[PDB]
Amino acid sequence: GTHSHGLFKKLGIPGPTPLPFLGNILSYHKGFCMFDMECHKKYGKVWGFYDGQQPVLAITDPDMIKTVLVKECYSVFTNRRPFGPVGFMKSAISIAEDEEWKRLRSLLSPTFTSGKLKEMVPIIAQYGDVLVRNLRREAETGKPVTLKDVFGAYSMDVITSTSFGVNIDSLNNPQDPFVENTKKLLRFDFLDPFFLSITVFPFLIPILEVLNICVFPREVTNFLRKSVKRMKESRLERVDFLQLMIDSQNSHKALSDLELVAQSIIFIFAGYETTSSVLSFIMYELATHPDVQQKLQEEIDAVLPNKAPPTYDTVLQMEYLDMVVNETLRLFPIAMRLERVCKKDVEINGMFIPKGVVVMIPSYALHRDPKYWTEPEKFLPERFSKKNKDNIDPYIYTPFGSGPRNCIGMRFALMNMKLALIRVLQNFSFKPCKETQIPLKLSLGGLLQPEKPVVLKVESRD
């Protein structure tokens, strides 16, 4: 079982020595992120490894990265690594490929313009208020609060309302069937037995498609499909993603009906647990660095006096806030990696890359690389002080990727998280208990998350 295993020794590329059938996956005991640093540390600029039989080429040079992510994105590095039995979700933009990806992407971009984002701020700012009362209510009771729980509820509230115009406080209405289903849409752990099996036996993926076994829980997708077509149905009696999409069905185009339901499902999958994880990582950093939390609270109260409500304009005004957000994303880029399938023999910047190879950018590692980042391990928001910008390479730092296929939901996710932080920090402060793990521990699994969940105390500023 060493078919594609000769490739990198042939081209003269360095790397860890692959076992038959398994390749290098046994090196994943430490998790993706620490496998990526070790390889960087030990082979340097470039290296090669095998996910089962699948050869993966890591690159860390910013010029090489740009060529891949930007310059030719369209005729060579268009698609992501196929990853599992996927059924109708093959039409979701993050999963679609080549020409149909390109069609969806430009059908869906107008939905993410800045105009639309502003129509949406009074809708998401509403759940900023909701989150606050939920927070005071169980902070004036004492004591430890689980962030992932309060920020998950907030992330859900904001998705349900901007995706579908469904307005519920999910923390307190925990069983609207709409809360129950959408909550099951978590990010995939690719070190789970199921995905490691799939990686070693990818010839099994088609078999699973046949039995209609899918990585998106068929019971949840059923629910949303029936939900959506009913929403479209009883709407022929503003503003939300569903609506913007229903409109771009009225004149590549003819954004399909089922194509629409797929995008709706995938927007949830993309924004729900991502947004809640980052908010947790940030609020963890703010509790462990009162320096920074105090400075932010002071910045907020100068832009928004008398606990005044955040607007779009006052949000972009706050550059210490922006500093904290980015410095958190550096330390914890929850994507971990960026990947493109190389779909033709190509020659980029002097390195020959044979057709079929997965080219991989180790985002977690580059964000912690001693060259570009002084004291890489410490939470230092001053890195992003507008002084030191332009000392920041947009290809080293890539928490939302880069190029035509970057995070289409970026400015939304950024605006979402900031409005949440502001409303929270206008009202509360967050101290570390010692149910709190200090310092933080990342998971040995395939998701960038804390080992044990983050718990803190929440004091009302009154």
Ligand code: HEM
């Ligand atoms: C803090 C929250 C988020 C982070 C850190 C994040 C990060 C990322 C990253 C790294 C990628 C891959 C980009 C690449 O391959 O270069 C991505 C893709 C994507 N994200 Fe986000 N994301 C977040 C939230 C969201 C939200 C809220 C949405 C939608 C509402 C969203 C929708 C997408 C979509 C649709 C793609 C694939 C786009 C395509 O393939 O054309 N993400 N995200």
Ligand SMILES: CC(=O)[C@H]1CC[C@H]2[C@@H]3CCC4=CC(=O)CC[C@]4(C)[C@H]3CC[C@]12C
């Ligand atoms: C947590 C996670 O990544 C999810 C995504 C796809 C999910 C799997 C999908 C297929 C599946 C079918 C089963 O009957 C057992 C559970 C499993 C094996 C699921 C376990 C949890 C997985 C691995």
